[PDB]
Amino acid sequence: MLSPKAATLAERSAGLAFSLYQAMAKDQAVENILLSPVVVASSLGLVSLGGKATTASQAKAVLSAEQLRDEEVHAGLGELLRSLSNVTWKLGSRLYGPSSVSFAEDFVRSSKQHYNCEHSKINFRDKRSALQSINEWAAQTTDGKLPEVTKDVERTDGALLVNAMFFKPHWDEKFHHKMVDNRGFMVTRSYTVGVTMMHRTGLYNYYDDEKEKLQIVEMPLAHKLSSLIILMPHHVEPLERLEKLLTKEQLKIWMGKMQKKAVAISLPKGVVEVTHDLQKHLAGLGLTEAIDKNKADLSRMSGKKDLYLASVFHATAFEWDTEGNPFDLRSPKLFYADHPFIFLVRDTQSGSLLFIGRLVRPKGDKM
Amino acid sequence: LSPKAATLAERSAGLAFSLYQAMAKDQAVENILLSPVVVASSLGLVSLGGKATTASQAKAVLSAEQLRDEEVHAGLGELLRTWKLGSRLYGPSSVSFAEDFVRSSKQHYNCEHSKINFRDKRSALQSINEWAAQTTDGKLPEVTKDVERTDGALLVNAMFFKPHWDEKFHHKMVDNRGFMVTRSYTVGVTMMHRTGLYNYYDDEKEKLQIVEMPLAHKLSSLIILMPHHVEPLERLEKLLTKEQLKIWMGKMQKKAVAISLPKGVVEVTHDLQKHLAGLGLTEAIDKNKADLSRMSGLYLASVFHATAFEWDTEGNPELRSPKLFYADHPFIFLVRDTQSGSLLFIGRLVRPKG
C-alpha cells in the first residue's frame, strides 16, 4: 500500500511514461520500446537532487511535481523504487562523470539514500575502456541478462546516467515447458523473423474490438498481485494506428469491456533487450537546461558548473518465459502474437504502471 | 529390376510425359490419372495381338522398334507384376479370341477376355461397370456412361491406388477447407494436414513449389508440383519434362514442411483411343486398316484407363518454422519407384468432388 506522496508520484510517473512512449513511438528511428515509469521518474529526481535553479525546477516540471517539496519527491520516489523489488527483478543506477570531475559528498550520500545511485569516474577519451566499464556494470547488475547498454559514448564532456534492468513476468498460470516451438514472427507483411513461441490455453480476461480491429488480453502475474496486458491489431500493420487509441481513458474502457473467456495465447519466447537514451525525449518534454553544456547547473553533484547531462540510459532485458505458478475451453479464441503488439505491466492493488512497451522486432534471423 | 524390365521401364516413363502432355492440351479434360506401365502394357497387347504396321506402330509408340517382341512382352510383364488392377479385352459376340493369344496375353499382361452384345447398351455398360467395381472392391463403381464404338474391341483397365505414407497423417488432422479451382470458383473440400521433414524446393523464379512424400518403407515416393498461387496448370506443364524433373529433384533439400492436401477419392476415366493415335498408333484404331488377326475376327475402338486414386491419412506409424505446401489449388503429381526411377503414376488434380 502506497503512502499519499507515493500514490500521486505513481500517477505522475505513469502520465510521463505515456507521454514518453507516445514521443518515442512518433520517432521513426525507434523500434522496440521498454519503459519503467518509476525508473524514468527517478532520473528526473536525481537531476533535481544534483541541480540548482531552472536545471532542477525543469526536472520537477517534466514529472509534473513542481508544486511538491523536494523532500516529498525524493521520499515518494524512494518508496516507489523499493516497491519495485518486493527474486527476478533487477535494477541498478550509476552516474558516470569524466575523470576531470569530483562528486560532492552530500549528493553521493543522499543519491545513495533515496535512489540507490552509484557514482563512477570514467576516461571517456578511451572509448573502448569506457564502454567496457558501463556494459560490465550493467551485466553484473542483471546477472548477464543485459550484457551491453550502448555501442557508443559520442561526447567526452558530460555526465552519463545509466539505469540497467532485468524484468521477467511470472505467470499466475505457467506455460508448459514443452508447449514451445519455432514459428515465424511477421515484422511487416513482407518481412518474417524466425522466433521461438510459447503456447497456452486458459481462462483469460479478453476483449475483441471489431470496430477498431484489435484484441486485448489480460494475463495475471503470480498471486494476482499484478497483470500483463497485451494490445494487438487483428493483422500485421504498424503500431501507429493503435497508438492513437492508446490513452489512460481508452484503456479503462477496454478493461471494463473485458470478460473471462477461453483464450489460446501464443507469445514469442525469449529475452528482449532495449536501450533507450532518453536524453532527447526528456529534453523535448521540458528538460532543456540539464542537457545544454552552456546552461546546465549540476553544481550540487560536482561542486561547480563543469557538468551537463549527456545521456540518460534506460536499458532493459525483458524476458518472456514459460515459468509461472504450478497451477494448471473447447473452442478458444486465438491471441496469436506473431506480429507487433503493445504491452503494459500493472500492479493490481495500486494500479501503478511497472512497465509500458511494444514488441515490433524480436531477435532472430530473417526468413 | 532385371535388365529387360529396367530397359523397358525408361520407355514406359518416356511415354508417360508424352501422353500426359497430349491429354493436358485437350480442353475437355479436367483431372488426369495415368499409370505409365498400364498404358505401355496396352501397346504391348496391340503388338502381341497385331500384325505388320498395326503391331510395328505399337512398338514405335513404345520406342521399342529395335527390341525383340519376346523382350518387350517379358520386360513389360515383369514391370507390371494398395494397388488393385484389372485388364480385360471386350470383343463383339460375333468374335472368338485365339487360344495362343489368350494364353500369352494372360502370361504377360494378366489380360482377361469377354464377349459382349451391344444390342442392349445398358446391359453392356452394366457388365463393364460391375467387372470394374469387383476389380476395385467398389472403389471404382463406374467406368463409362457410354460406348461410342460398338463394332470394335474395347480394352478396359480398371484401377484402385491408395498411397500409404512412410509417415502417416494424424486421423484427426482433417477439416473442411475451400479448394480454389480458379480465382473466382471455390469448392468445399476435406483437407488432411501434417508437418514433417520433407525433400523440398521452392523455385522463386518459375513461381512453384515441389515436395517429395516418401511412401511406405521408402520404396517409392509421391512428388507434388504446384504453382505459388491459383492459376491454370498450362504454364507449369510447359516446364514439366523428364529433364526439368531431374534438375528440381537435385535442387531439393530436407526441410520442415507443413503439407495440406485434399482428402478423398479422385475417380477418372480416360479413353486413350484418340491420344495414342496422336502418338503414332493410327492403324490399330482404324476399322478399315487394323490387323488384329493374332487375336482373330477387329479394330481397337477404345482403351479405357479408369482409376480411383485415394488421398487418405493412413501410413506407417526440433523442426524449424515450417514452409507451407497448402494444396488448395490445382497441382501435378507423380508416383515414382525409388530404386528404378520408374513412374507408377502421373496425374493432376484440377477439380475435386467436394
Binding site: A264, P332, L334 | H170, K172, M173
Partner: peptide, 14 residues
C-alpha cells in the same frame, strides 16, 4: 489431441 487451426493467413498484395 491435435491443437486448433492456426489464424487466417494475411491478405494478398494489391
Amino acid at each position: 489431441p491435435p491443437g486448433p487451426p492456426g489464424p487466417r493467413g494475411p491478405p494478398g498484395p494489391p
